[PDB]
Amino acid sequence: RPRFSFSIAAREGKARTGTIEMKRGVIRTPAFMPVGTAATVKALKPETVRATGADIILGNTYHLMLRPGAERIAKLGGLHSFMGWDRPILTDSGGFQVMSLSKQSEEGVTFKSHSRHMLSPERSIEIQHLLGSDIVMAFDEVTPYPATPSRAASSMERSMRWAKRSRDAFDSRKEQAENAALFGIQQGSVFENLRQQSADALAEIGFDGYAVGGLSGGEGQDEMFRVLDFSVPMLPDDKPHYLMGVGKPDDIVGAVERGIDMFDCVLPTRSGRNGQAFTWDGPINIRNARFSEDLKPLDSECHCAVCQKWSRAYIHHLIRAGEILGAMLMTEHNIAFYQQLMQKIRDSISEGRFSQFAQDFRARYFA
Amino acid sequence: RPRFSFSIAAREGKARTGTIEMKRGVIRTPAFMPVGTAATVKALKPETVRATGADIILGNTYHLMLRPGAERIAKLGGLHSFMGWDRPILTDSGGFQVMSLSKQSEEGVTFKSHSRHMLSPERSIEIQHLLGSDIVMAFDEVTPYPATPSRAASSMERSMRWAKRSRDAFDSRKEQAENAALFGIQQGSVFENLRQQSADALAEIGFDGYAVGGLSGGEGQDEMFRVLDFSVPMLPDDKPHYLMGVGKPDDIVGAVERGIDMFDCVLPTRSGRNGQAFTWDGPINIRNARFSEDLKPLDSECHCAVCQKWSRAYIHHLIRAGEILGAMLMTEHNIAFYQQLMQKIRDSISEGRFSQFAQDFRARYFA
Ligand SMILES: [Zn+2]
Ligand SMILES: [Zn+2]
């Protein structure tokens, strides 16, 4: 396989289905990436993550650089070997979690662990190298929501300067440039002209893929969709489009309708341990008393191992009791659900019936 | 298969190896039973528990009757169906956890949930029926350690009265009597004559197996072994001998040397989630800094899936980070370790080299 190849096999309106080929394997698009925070997809063995259909996982650079540490992971053979996942890994740059969980300047950011630490385009790319990441995210500056036009512009500008620095850091490391891919991130808040300026700048630098950054931050789905409506067509058509941190099933469906090829989100894992299970008739909270003697599976059609073997009543009990197996089963189911969602999307695009799928999906999910 | 058949295939001194055949499957003896507290072996799917080599698990009646409730489990199809374990299950009577976790009389005990509840020989046996238990423990009275001779005697007497009541409750329920087995429990603290009186009384009532109750309560291994020395030969030779709540590896080895065929204990599960891993060179606490860059498996010889795929360094990280996968891997390893211990014991008895095994095991484990 090549370092990186993205091919589109089929289209319907703005939606695309296809594949990204990388050395560690093929990624089917549109793709959903389970989140590995600190070198683990919570409550699942890597074999289980794969069994659900995941082709790629995400790793959180901020968490890894704190614990167990980037240099340490490299000493130990890199993230894939350390955690037992041998397929592609996308790493974020660490910058988001800096702002939400942890001194800012043109050089980068210093911060204290939730221990003093530093990140910058250079160090970020370096850390992702040390981890052995297959898909490297450029380091950008977070743009809060809402942001004024002035501040959105200043920050987008900085982020494009940081994108160039990311590109150069990445390219100067031969091992990294030969074996990994680099994605740039579009900024500009909700403003069309800034989104265009950002797209243009990223395209001129040139990346293997392009993320739409800065959304799912409080603006709500209508605004997110309106921004996607004009922002995604600005990106190069022949490269992957990644919508960072977007994961409700209806968000995913609408985002694919607007040209997005890749997603990540902690909802299936997070929501799973907390009691929320996804179903084709909408989410359920398994802790509800209504499930205490319900012998049905979490979902009536789901092909996952959990739905083949255990009842709502049992999982209800486990989660009420705070048992680890409850978290394990809920998580496996929810990630499997998401992968079946992605498969149905891929198939429907390939068959030119994605519009009808989106309709059918919503009528039932929000019934 | 029959309701219950115990056959001894080989002997060495007081040690025995053989099999218990029951409707739900064969149990290899000497046997170690992973503890399913509230209808789950903590952090493991039943398929994983089986993969480690377990033939039978234990269920805690006290916990189940509190949550999710005995009647509820019966409504739902019984414990095996509810939790996804289709091999034999031994249930305790609930009485121990009453005294350690929750009004006492000749009738039984009432207590408040850690909701007011009640247990007695009759209700205990009934609850174990509702759960669908394959091996039913008679309901007895706990004898604290230390106990005076007078109190040890009074309580042992009560427990033998309760043993008769257990036997009669069990036999009066045709479904239970035809499909399950009933074990009696020997009491008498550390006193030989009371242990003899108890053995005699149990044998006269007649049970499918006989537990040595009242040990591993603070007396320490030397005293436990001294009591086993005279107490186990008092039990019928042709039925299983169960030592309740005994689980350190050296305790198990010495107990088998004295005639015990069955064990349960929460150490491998409990100790696992807390960081303790069993090895043939002795336990280790994986949280220790010494393991942060150790690429070796938990144990150099262990055949378990954990030791084939992950390093000490990774598990170290997971447990330090409070990740659920750390608990999963530690537990799978420790239960697998215990099952390999039981296998080595079985094989060595079958080959007439158990004495040498016990020697070799100790010299290395306590090196
Ligand atoms: Zn499912
Ligand atoms: Zn192992």
Tell me if chain B has a CB within 8 Å of the CB of A72.
yes
| Closest residue by Cα to residue B38 from B60, B23, B17, B15 | B60
| Closest residue by Cα to residue A68 from B273, B311, B299, B328 | B311
| Least Cα separation, residue B325 to chain A (angstroms) | 5
Distance in angstroms (rounded) separating the CA atoms of residues A337 and A195? 33
- Give the closest of A75, A320, A325 to B43, CB-based: A325
Tell me if chain B has a CB within 8 Å of the CB of A328.
yes
Q: Which residue of B has its CA nearest to A73?
A: B293
DSSP notation for B212-281: E-S-SSSS-HHHHHHHHHHHGGGS-TTS-EEETT---HHHHHHHHHTT--EEE-SIIIIIHHHTEE--TT
State whether residue A20 is helix, strand or coil. strand
| Residue pair B278/B251 in contact by the 8 Å Cβ criterion | no
Catalytic residue among A55, A251, A261, A264: A264
For residue A290, the tally of other CB atoms under 10 A from its CB is: 12
Distance in angstroms (rounded) separating the CA atoms of residues B366 and B279? 11
Distance in angstroms (rounded) separating the CA atoms of residues A64 and B290? 20
Calculate the alpha carbon distances from B364 to A319, B314, B343, B344, B361 in Å. 41, 26, 18, 15, 6
Token pair recorded at residue A367: 């019934």
Cα angle for residues A161, A264, A324 (degrees, 5° grid): 135
Secondary structure element (H or E) that encloses residue B326, with its range: helix B324-350
Q: For chain A, report the end-to-end CA distance as a whole number of angstroms.
A: 44
B52 Cα: distance to centroid of ligand 2 (angstroms): 10
Tell me if chain B has a CB within 8 Å of the CB of A321.
yes
A334 Cα: distance to centroid of ligand 1 (angstroms): 7
| Residue pair B31/B262 in contact by the 8 Å Cβ criterion | yes
Mutation pick from B67, B323, B324 vs chain A, by most beta carbons of A within 10 Å, is B324
State whether residue A80 is helix, strand or coil. helix
Mutation pick from A37, A40, A304 vs chain B, by most beta carbons of B within 10 Å, is A40
| Closest residue by Cα to residue B227 from B193, B253, B250 | B193
Calculate the alpha carbon distances from A210 to A144, A242, B67 in Å. 20, 6, 50
Tell me if chain A has a CB within 8 Å of the CB of B293.
yes
> Among this protein's residues, is A229 annotated catalytic?
no
Distance in angstroms (rounded) separating the CA atoms of residues A14 and A39? 34
Tell me if chain A has a CB within 8 Å of the CB of B146.
no
| Residue pair B299/B272 in contact by the 8 Å Cβ criterion | no
Secondary structure element (H or E) that encloses residue A36, with its range: strand A35-36
Q: For chain B, report the end-to-end CA distance as a whole number of angstroms.
A: 44
State whether residue A207 is helix, strand or coil. coil
Distance in angstroms (rounded) separating the CA atoms of residues A338 and A351? 20
Tell me if chain A has a CB within 8 Å of the CB of B86.
no
List chain B residues with CB under 8 Å of A43.
324-325, 328
List chain B residues with CB under 8 Å of A40.
318, 323, 325
| Residue pair B342/B30 in contact by the 8 Å Cβ criterion | yes
| Residue pair A345/A355 in contact by the 8 Å Cβ criterion | no
| Residue pair A158/A106 in contact by the 8 Å Cβ criterion | yes
A307 Cα: distance to centroid of ligand 1 (angstroms): 4
Instruction: Give the resolution value in Å.
Output: 1.6
For residue B363, the tally of other CB atoms under 10 A from its CB is: 9
> Can you list the domains of chain B with their CATH numbers?
1-367 (3.20.20.105)
- For A216, list phi and psi in degrees, rounded to 5: 55, 45
List chain A residues with CB under 8 Å of B67.
317, 320-321
| Residue pair A36/A83 in contact by the 8 Å Cβ criterion | yes
Distance in angstroms (rounded) separating the CA atoms of residues A149 and A52? 42
Calculate the alpha carbon distances from A172 to A2, A122, B292 in Å. 20, 10, 31
List chain A residues with CB under 8 Å of B44.
325
Q: Left (φ > 0), alpha (ψ -120 to 50) or beta: where does A84 sit?
A: left
CB contact under 8 A, A292 and B68: yes
Catalytic residue among A92, A134, A208, A261: A92
Distance in angstroms (rounded) separating the CA atoms of residues A332 and A48? 7
DSSP notation for A266-292: SIIIIIHHHTEE--TT--EETTSGGGT
Token pair recorded at residue A356: 């009808």
Give me the residues paired with residue B29 across strands: B18
Tell me if chain B has a CB within 8 Å of the CB of A292.
yes
> Among this protein's residues, is A264 annotated catalytic?
yes
Distance in angstroms (rounded) separating the CA atoms of residues A219 and A214? 10
| Least Cα separation, residue B229 to chain A (angstroms) | 39
List chain B residues with CB under 8 Å of A306.
none
